[PDB]
């Protein structure tokens, strides 16, 4: 009233509001984990020149699987920070797996050239993804040598990123036609990474899987886990039921949603009920209690 003496009567003073206590988050059962054990745990890593794309689109990107081998020496991110990357929407994931040698792995990095980053492979300096280091040369190297690491050694120019060069064209480095035979400056464009389990830190085998992400105009289908919380009812909470954040009280409902129906509405288009993603249940939503606060006073 902006006055010190209050006349006898009833006055509207404030607006009582029940406030939420918990922040409920509900998302469906975490299924269809993205295939990574086939690329992270495999002894048939492709050759550096003969690398292979990996198609990973229709699944949940369990990006935290990197902690299956937390002894990773390095996990250098190049597209985005991992904290943000636990939930990011991309249209496709392309991974390639190979082993080159020792300390040459620094060549698998933005702004790097030479050998591996020259003709065997290369990545653009704006590369999106991460480069990992879990060298397991214990079985990759044998005292017999393992010269079977088929790797291209020669090429006319630098290798374009994300292109496969299985060509076997002789490096005619001399001023004389080669005709494919081995004469002078005529050597087969491929050589050997024969490594025994005694080589140096820059010559022993390695363990490489690098994966990149992309997002074109097609809608994104690559996403991380949603981490749904528990479900609690009969008290004002802050729920998030897969597409809609709202403050309200959830109660058991007798509504009969059709099997395909998620939301629930009434006149004026306000969400009155929700189907729970994890367990198939119908929860009615009631707005948290509120209302004016009148003060009955004598003078």
């Amino acid at each position: 009233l902006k006055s010190f003496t209050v006349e006898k009567g009833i006055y509207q003073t404030s607006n009582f509001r029940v406030q939420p206590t918990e922040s409920i988050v509900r998302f469906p059962n975490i299924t269809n984990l993205c295939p990574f054990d086939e690329v992270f745990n495999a002894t048939r890593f492709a050759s550096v020149y003969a690398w292979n794309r990996k198609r990973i689109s229709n699944c949940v990107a369990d990006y935290s699987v990197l902690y299956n081998f937390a002894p990773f020496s390095a996990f250098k991110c190049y597209g985005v920070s991992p904290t943000k990357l636990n939930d990011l929407c991309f249209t496709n994931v392309y991974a390639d797996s190979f082993v080159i040698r020792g300390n040459e792995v620094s060549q698998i990095a933005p702004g790097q050239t030479g050998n591996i980053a020259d003709y065997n492979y290369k990545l653009p300096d704006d590369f999106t993804g991460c480069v990992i280091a879990w060298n397991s040369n214990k079985l990759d190297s044998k005292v017999g040598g393992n010269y079977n690491y088929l790797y291209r050694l020669f090429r006319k120019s630098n290798l374009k990123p994300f292109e496969r060069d299985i060509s076997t064209e002789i490096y005619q480095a001399g001023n004389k036609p080669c005709n494919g035979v081995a004469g002078f400056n005529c050597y087969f464009p491929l050589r050997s990474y024969g490594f025994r389990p005694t080589y140096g830190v820059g010559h022993q085998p390695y363990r490489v899987v690098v994966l990149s992400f992309e997002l074109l105009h097609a809608p994104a289908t690559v996403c991380g886990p949603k981490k749904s919380t528990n479900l609690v009812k009969n008290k004002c909470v802050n729920f998030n039921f897969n597409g809609l954040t709202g403050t309200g009280v959830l109660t058991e409902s007798n509504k009969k949603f059709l099997p395909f129906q998620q939301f629930g509405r009434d006149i004026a288009d306000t969400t009155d009920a929700v189907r729970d993603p994890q367990t198939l249940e119908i929860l009615d939503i009631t707005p948290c209690s509120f209302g004016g606060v009148s003060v009955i006073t004598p003078g």
């Binding site: 198609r55 689109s57 229709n58 249209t91 074109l216 105009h217 097609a218 809608p219 289908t221 509504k255 009969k256 949603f257 059709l258 395909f260 129906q261 998620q262 939301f263 629930g264 509405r265 009434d266 006149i267 009920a273 189907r275």
Partner: protein, 204 residues
């Protein structure tokens, strides 16, 4: 044959996943106009524009699947829905098959009577609604088309063909409808707000 038949009041799907009970809802969407005319093909390929209303009655499983996407092969990818009576496989990895059916693979989704189907592309999603009805021909009456799938394939589709009767075809148009949800979210009746002035009054 390319006869033409009245569409009656057919080809109404659920516009979204929202539940509604005992309410009349006015929605603007790609609907098949009431009492329109529809081809009754038994033609190489029909176009797509902005959605179709494929329907069929032949239970012999001879109308097996469909082909979508611009052109037919070797470019811009092509959807290849093919049924198998046990598997309902959908492939977006084109077969490169002949023009009269009987590559960079990227999608391999797997899952007396009248069958009604609606296909649409809005923005990167191929939505398929469908419905079965024990018809006692497109009978007069009403039966809403419950959604089946919402594929996230980002193709651009302009024409379509069909695998191999009752090759009904109708074309969706942007229309405003007034749908009725009886008490359980089932669309029991609809009013086409541009058919006749009485329906305009009903929608108003």
């Amino acid at each position: 044959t390319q006869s033409y038949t009245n569409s009656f009041t057919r080809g109404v799907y659920y516009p979204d996943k929202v539940f509604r009970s005992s309410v009349l809802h006015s929605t603007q969407d790609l609907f098949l106009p009431f009492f329109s005319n529809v081809t009754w093909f038994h033609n190489p390929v029909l176009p797509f524009n902005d959605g179709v209303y494929f329907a069929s009655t032949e239970k012999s499983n001879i109308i097996r699947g469909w082909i979508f996407g611009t052109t037919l092969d070797s470019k811009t990818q092509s959807l290849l829905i093919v049924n198998n009576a046990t598997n309902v496989v959908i492939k977006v990895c084109e077969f490169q098959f002949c023009n009269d059916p009987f590559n960079n693979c990227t999608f391999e989704y797997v899952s007396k009577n009248l069958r009604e189907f609606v296909f649409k592309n809005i923005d990167g999603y191929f939505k398929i609604y469908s419905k079965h009805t024990p018809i006692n021909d497109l009978p007069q009456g009403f039966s809403a088309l419950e959604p089946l799938v919402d594929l996230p394939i980002g193709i651009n589709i302009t024409r379509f063909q069909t695998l191999l009767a009752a090759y009904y075809v109708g074309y969706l148009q942007p229309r405003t409808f007034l749908l009725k949800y009886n008490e359980n979210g089932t669309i029991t009746d609809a009013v086409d707000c541009a058919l006749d002035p009485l329906s305009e009054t009903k929608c108003t």
